[PDB]
Nucleic acid binder design. Structure first.
Length: 216
RNA sequence: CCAAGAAAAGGACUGGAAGAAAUCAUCCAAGUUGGGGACUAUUUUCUGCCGUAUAGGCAG
Protein backbone atom coordinates (compact mmCIF):
# COMPACT_ATOMS: atom_id res chain seq x y z
CA UNK A 1 0.00 0.00 0.00
CA UNK A 2 1.24 3.50 -1.10
CA UNK A 3 0.01 4.81 2.29
CA UNK A 4 3.11 3.25 3.93
CA UNK A 5 5.38 5.39 1.66
CA UNK A 6 3.17 8.44 2.53
CA UNK A 7 3.55 7.93 6.30
CA UNK A 8 7.36 7.55 5.94
CA UNK A 9 7.54 10.77 3.82
CA UNK A 10 9.21 13.92 5.32
CA UNK A 11 5.90 15.86 5.02
CA UNK A 12 3.80 13.36 7.09
CA UNK A 13 3.37 12.84 10.85
CA UNK A 14 5.99 10.43 12.32
CA UNK A 15 4.87 6.84 13.16
CA UNK A 16 5.94 4.48 15.98
CA UNK A 17 8.09 1.30 15.30
CA UNK A 18 8.46 -0.01 18.95
CA UNK A 19 8.51 -3.90 18.89
CA UNK A 20 8.63 -3.96 15.05
CA UNK A 21 12.43 -3.28 14.58
CA UNK A 22 12.81 -6.38 12.32
CA UNK A 23 10.20 -5.29 9.68
CA UNK A 24 11.34 -1.63 10.04
CA UNK A 25 14.88 -2.61 8.86
CA UNK A 26 13.31 -4.62 5.96
CA UNK A 27 11.03 -1.79 4.74
CA UNK A 28 13.68 0.94 5.15
CA UNK A 29 16.33 -1.13 3.25
CA UNK A 30 13.80 -1.99 0.48
CA UNK A 31 13.08 1.77 -0.07
CA UNK A 32 16.63 2.17 -1.56
CA UNK A 33 15.46 0.68 -4.91
CA UNK A 34 13.52 2.38 -7.78
CA UNK A 35 9.68 1.79 -7.36
CA UNK A 36 9.58 -0.10 -10.77
CA UNK A 37 11.82 -2.97 -9.37
CA UNK A 38 9.95 -3.63 -6.02
CA UNK A 39 6.54 -5.51 -5.84
CA UNK A 40 6.55 -5.11 -1.97
CA UNK A 41 8.58 -3.29 0.81
CA UNK A 42 7.74 -6.32 3.12
CA UNK A 43 9.82 -9.10 1.38
CA UNK A 44 12.46 -10.39 3.97
CA UNK A 45 14.41 -12.19 1.16
CA UNK A 46 15.05 -9.02 -0.94
CA UNK A 47 16.21 -7.23 2.30
CA UNK A 48 18.60 -10.13 3.26
CA UNK A 49 19.99 -9.97 -0.35
CA UNK A 50 20.37 -6.10 -0.35
CA UNK A 51 22.15 -6.24 3.10
CA UNK A 52 24.89 -8.63 1.76
CA UNK A 53 25.82 -6.06 -0.97
CA UNK A 54 28.58 -4.02 0.86
CA UNK A 55 28.83 -1.67 -2.23
CA UNK A 56 25.06 -0.79 -2.18
CA UNK A 57 25.23 -0.17 1.64
CA UNK A 58 28.59 1.73 1.27
CA UNK A 59 26.89 4.05 -1.32
CA UNK A 60 24.07 4.51 1.30
CA UNK A 61 26.55 5.13 4.22
CA UNK A 62 28.20 7.95 2.12
CA UNK A 63 24.93 10.03 2.01
CA UNK A 64 25.12 10.59 5.83
CA UNK A 65 27.96 13.10 5.24
CA UNK A 66 25.39 15.72 3.94
CA UNK A 67 22.45 15.32 6.46
CA UNK A 68 21.58 18.89 7.72
CA UNK A 69 19.14 20.80 10.10
CA UNK A 70 19.07 23.98 7.89
CA UNK A 71 19.21 23.92 3.99
CA UNK A 72 21.65 26.56 2.41
CA UNK A 73 20.52 25.51 -1.17
CA UNK A 74 16.71 25.80 -0.73
CA UNK A 75 15.80 28.84 -2.93
CA UNK A 76 18.63 28.23 -5.47
CA UNK A 77 20.30 24.93 -6.40
CA UNK A 78 23.48 26.77 -7.61
CA UNK A 79 24.78 27.35 -4.01
CA UNK A 80 27.94 25.17 -3.51
CA UNK A 81 29.89 24.26 -0.30
CA UNK A 82 29.31 22.62 3.20
CA UNK A 83 26.16 21.53 5.22
CA UNK A 84 24.80 23.40 8.35
CA UNK A 85 23.86 21.60 11.69
CA UNK A 86 22.69 23.91 14.54
CA UNK A 87 20.42 23.49 17.60
CA UNK A 88 17.29 25.73 17.47
CA UNK A 89 17.70 29.29 18.96
CA UNK A 90 16.14 30.15 22.40
CA UNK A 91 12.38 30.95 22.23
CA UNK A 92 11.41 34.65 21.84
CA UNK A 93 7.81 35.19 23.21
CA UNK A 94 6.79 37.40 20.22
CA UNK A 95 8.22 35.26 17.32
CA UNK A 96 7.21 32.01 15.54
CA UNK A 97 10.40 29.98 14.76
CA UNK A 98 12.01 26.50 15.07
CA UNK A 99 12.70 27.18 18.82
CA UNK A 100 9.44 25.39 19.85
CA UNK A 101 10.01 22.27 17.63
CA UNK A 102 11.86 18.97 18.23
CA UNK A 103 15.20 18.01 16.48
CA UNK A 104 14.93 16.69 12.80
CA UNK A 105 17.39 16.25 9.81
CA UNK A 106 17.06 16.16 5.95
CA UNK A 107 19.25 15.49 2.82
CA UNK A 108 20.63 17.53 -0.23
CA UNK A 109 23.96 16.89 -2.13
CA UNK A 110 24.21 15.75 -5.86
CA UNK A 111 20.47 14.91 -6.79
CA UNK A 112 21.25 11.15 -7.52
CA UNK A 113 20.91 10.02 -3.82
CA UNK A 114 17.04 10.26 -3.60
CA UNK A 115 16.63 6.45 -2.94
CA UNK A 116 20.09 5.52 -1.43
CA UNK A 117 19.77 8.36 1.19
CA UNK A 118 16.41 6.86 2.51
CA UNK A 119 18.13 3.98 4.49
CA UNK A 120 19.72 6.28 7.15
CA UNK A 121 17.97 9.71 6.82
CA UNK A 122 14.36 8.47 7.28
CA UNK A 123 12.97 9.41 10.71
CA UNK A 124 10.47 7.53 12.97
CA UNK A 125 9.08 7.58 16.58
CA UNK A 126 10.91 5.19 18.98
CA UNK A 127 10.89 4.86 22.82
CA UNK A 128 8.38 7.76 22.56
CA UNK A 129 10.86 10.24 20.97
CA UNK A 130 11.99 11.36 17.46
CA UNK A 131 14.97 9.42 16.03
CA UNK A 132 16.24 7.74 12.82
CA UNK A 133 18.39 4.64 11.85
CA UNK A 134 21.80 6.46 11.83
CA UNK A 135 21.30 7.76 15.41
CA UNK A 136 20.24 4.36 16.89
CA UNK A 137 23.31 2.59 15.41
CA UNK A 138 25.82 5.39 16.35
CA UNK A 139 24.42 5.41 19.94
CA UNK A 140 24.88 1.55 20.13
CA UNK A 141 21.14 0.73 20.51
CA UNK A 142 21.21 -3.07 21.11
CA UNK A 143 17.61 -3.93 20.00
CA UNK A 144 18.27 -2.56 16.48
CA UNK A 145 21.73 -4.22 16.29
CA UNK A 146 20.30 -7.63 17.35
CA UNK A 147 17.60 -7.45 14.62
CA UNK A 148 20.19 -6.26 12.02
CA UNK A 149 22.64 -9.14 12.80
CA UNK A 150 19.59 -11.52 12.71
CA UNK A 151 18.79 -10.30 9.13
CA UNK A 152 22.26 -11.60 8.00
CA UNK A 153 24.85 -8.90 8.94
CA UNK A 154 28.24 -10.24 10.26
CA UNK A 155 29.23 -8.85 13.74
CA UNK A 156 32.57 -7.68 12.19
CA UNK A 157 30.71 -5.71 9.45
CA UNK A 158 28.61 -3.95 12.18
CA UNK A 159 31.69 -3.22 14.39
CA UNK A 160 33.27 -1.35 11.39
CA UNK A 161 30.11 0.55 10.29
CA UNK A 162 29.35 1.88 13.83
CA UNK A 163 32.74 3.69 13.47
CA UNK A 164 32.42 4.99 9.87
CA UNK A 165 28.72 5.89 10.38
CA UNK A 166 29.56 7.85 13.58
CA UNK A 167 32.58 9.57 11.89
CA UNK A 168 30.39 11.05 9.11
CA UNK A 169 28.33 12.93 11.80
CA UNK A 170 31.40 14.28 13.77
CA UNK A 171 32.67 17.23 11.61
CA UNK A 172 31.82 19.81 8.84
CA UNK A 173 28.79 21.22 10.77
CA UNK A 174 29.57 24.92 9.90
CA UNK A 175 30.66 26.32 6.44
CA UNK A 176 34.38 27.49 6.20
CA UNK A 177 33.70 30.52 3.83
CA UNK A 178 30.54 32.38 2.67
CA UNK A 179 29.41 30.73 -0.64
CA UNK A 180 29.39 33.12 -3.72
CA UNK A 181 25.68 32.45 -4.53
CA UNK A 182 24.33 33.07 -0.97
CA UNK A 183 22.41 36.19 0.15
CA UNK A 184 24.11 38.98 2.24
CA UNK A 185 22.20 41.99 3.88
CA UNK A 186 23.55 44.55 6.48
CA UNK A 187 22.03 46.51 9.41
CA UNK A 188 23.19 48.25 12.63
CA UNK A 189 23.76 45.96 15.68
CA UNK A 190 25.20 47.18 19.04
CA UNK A 191 26.27 50.52 17.46
CA UNK A 192 27.96 49.08 14.28
CA UNK A 193 27.18 47.09 11.03
CA UNK A 194 26.94 43.29 10.65
CA UNK A 195 26.10 41.16 7.58
CA UNK A 196 23.23 38.67 7.98
CA UNK A 197 22.62 35.59 5.81
CA UNK A 198 19.24 33.87 6.26
CA UNK A 199 18.65 30.10 5.88
CA UNK A 200 15.44 27.96 5.80
CA UNK A 201 14.69 25.60 8.69
CA UNK A 202 13.96 21.96 7.64
CA UNK A 203 11.77 21.14 10.69
CA UNK A 204 9.70 24.35 10.44
CA UNK A 205 8.93 24.10 6.70
CA UNK A 206 8.02 20.39 6.87
CA UNK A 207 5.50 21.04 9.70
CA UNK A 208 3.83 23.91 7.76
CA UNK A 209 3.10 21.55 4.83
CA UNK A 210 0.93 19.43 7.13
CA UNK A 211 -0.75 22.22 9.17
CA UNK A 212 -2.16 24.27 6.24
CA UNK A 213 -3.93 21.21 4.81
CA UNK A 214 -5.26 19.94 8.19
CA UNK A 215 -6.35 23.32 9.74
CA UNK A 216 -7.67 24.63 6.37
C1' C B 1 23.08 50.80 4.49
C1' C B 2 15.19 47.87 1.46
C1' A B 3 15.82 37.85 0.94
C1' A B 4 21.26 43.10 -1.30
C1' G B 5 23.26 44.45 -7.06
C1' A B 6 21.99 43.44 -13.35
C1' A B 7 17.50 40.54 -17.18
C1' A B 8 12.98 41.30 -24.56
C1' A B 9 8.51 35.23 -24.22
C1' G B 10 8.26 35.84 -29.43
C1' G B 11 6.52 33.99 -34.16
C1' A B 12 1.56 31.33 -37.75
C1' C B 13 -4.65 30.29 -37.63
C1' U B 14 -11.42 29.82 -41.47
C1' G B 15 -16.68 26.15 -36.16
C1' G B 16 -20.25 25.01 -39.93
C1' A B 17 -24.80 22.59 -41.70
C1' A B 18 -31.12 21.74 -40.59
C1' G B 19 -36.03 23.37 -37.24
C1' A B 20 -43.91 24.77 -36.00
C1' A B 21 -45.20 25.95 -28.45
C1' A B 22 -50.40 25.38 -28.71
C1' U B 23 -55.49 24.51 -27.02
C1' C B 24 -59.01 27.07 -23.09
C1' A B 25 -60.01 30.07 -19.34
C1' U B 26 -66.23 36.27 -15.55
C1' C B 27 -62.71 41.12 -10.02
C1' C B 28 -66.89 42.14 -7.18
C1' A B 29 -69.83 44.57 -3.42
C1' A B 30 -70.29 50.31 -0.01
C1' G B 31 -68.08 54.25 1.24
C1' U B 32 -69.38 63.52 3.74
C1' U B 33 -61.83 67.38 3.36
C1' G B 34 -62.74 71.72 6.27
C1' G B 35 -62.90 75.98 9.18
C1' G B 36 -60.01 82.25 9.13
C1' G B 37 -57.31 86.38 6.09
C1' A B 38 -55.42 94.44 3.77
C1' C B 39 -49.70 93.69 -1.56
C1' U B 40 -48.58 99.20 -0.62
C1' A B 41 -45.69 100.55 1.14
C1' U B 42 -41.06 107.47 2.09
C1' U B 43 -43.09 106.65 -3.42
C1' U B 44 -39.53 109.68 -8.42
C1' U B 45 -42.83 109.96 -14.59
C1' C B 46 -44.38 117.10 -13.05
C1' U B 47 -44.91 122.00 -16.46
C1' G B 48 -45.46 124.21 -21.52
C1' C B 49 -45.49 124.28 -27.43
C1' C B 50 -46.60 122.86 -33.01
C1' G B 51 -50.96 120.54 -34.83
C1' U B 52 -58.54 119.82 -37.55
C1' A B 53 -56.48 115.74 -33.58
C1' U B 54 -56.24 110.93 -26.63
C1' A B 55 -52.67 110.74 -34.46
C1' G B 56 -47.38 112.33 -34.87
C1' G B 57 -43.20 115.46 -33.67
C1' C B 58 -40.32 119.33 -29.71
C1' A B 59 -38.52 122.71 -25.21
C1' G B 60 -37.87 122.50 -19.61
Amino acid sequence: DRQLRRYLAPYSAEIGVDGAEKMALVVLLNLTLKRDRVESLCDEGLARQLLSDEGHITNCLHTVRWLHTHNLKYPDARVSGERLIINAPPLIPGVISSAGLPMRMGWAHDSSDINLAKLFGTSFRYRDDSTNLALQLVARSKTWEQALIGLGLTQQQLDIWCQLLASNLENNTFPTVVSPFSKQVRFLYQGNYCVVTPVVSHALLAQLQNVVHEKK
